[PDB]
């Protein structure tokens, strides 16, 4: 089964900062990979559809890249509404796998 990791385990940030997240995995020919985030007291919410297509109602700031074992999440700038933790997953078929996540620490 495909294994996956994420880094940095957390990132300290400032408002309007450009950020990115590394996610790595056993190789995946599928671009099925996707990203989501959650807040304390909140159910997870999808950020991007598989590969790079953004989830509906997601701000233009969001972006991402890659295929196979290496891919990433990017955000052009940050808003305080984006505080939370972030994840990525393998939806290539089954069993599903998920990253340990990251934390959006504040400066």
């Amino acid at each position: 089964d495909i294994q996956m990791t994420q880094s940095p385990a957390s990132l300290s940030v400032s408002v309007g900062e450009t950020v990115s997240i590394t996610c790595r995995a056993s190789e995946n020919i599928y671009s099925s990979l996707a990203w989501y985030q959650q807040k304390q007291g909140k159910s997870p919410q999808l950020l991007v559809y598989s590969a790079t297509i953004l989830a509906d109602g997601v701000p233009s700031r969001f972006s991402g890249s890659g295929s196979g074992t290496q891919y990433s999440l990017k955000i052009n700038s940050l808003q305080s509404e984006d505080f939370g933790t972030y994840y990525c997953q393998h939806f290539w078929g089954t069993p599903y796998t998920f990253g340990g996540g990251t934390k959006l620490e504040i400066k």
Binding site: Y30, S31, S32, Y49, S50, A51, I53
Partner: protein
């Protein structure tokens, strides 16, 4: 308005086509100065915006199943066209009915004076 089968959809679409509008040089119109027989191909990439690529695969499977029977019913050997016939029925479904405004057809624009 369909959803994916248990199979796993690869959202990527990497494809090739024979289309090539225009010609690089006037001699390229000529097969004698034309590209090698494999040179006709061109390629491009699409992504699963709005679920379209994956939706396409499911649609394709259903279409393939429907098509299999039709082909059994054909008598012609290489079935070079179908879409032309489909275009004809696209029109037939829209035409030969009575149609001023009252019928639910012909997309008549609202009436001005």
């Amino acid at each position: 308005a369909i959803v994916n089968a248990q199979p796993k959809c690869n959202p990527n679409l990497h494809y090739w086509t024979t289309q090539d509008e225009g010609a690089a040089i006037g001699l390229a119109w000529i097969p004698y100065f034309g590209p090698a027989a494999e040179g006709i191909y061109t390629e491009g990439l699409m992504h699963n915006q709005d679920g379209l690529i994956c939706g396409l695969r499911q649609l394709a499977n259903e279409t393939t199943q429907a098509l299999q029977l039709f082909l059994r019913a054909t008598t012609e050997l290489r079935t070079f066209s179908i879409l032309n016939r489909k275009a004809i029925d696209f029109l037939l479904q829209r035409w030969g009915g009575t149609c001023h405004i009252l019928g639910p057809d012909c997309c008549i624009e609202p009436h001005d004076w």
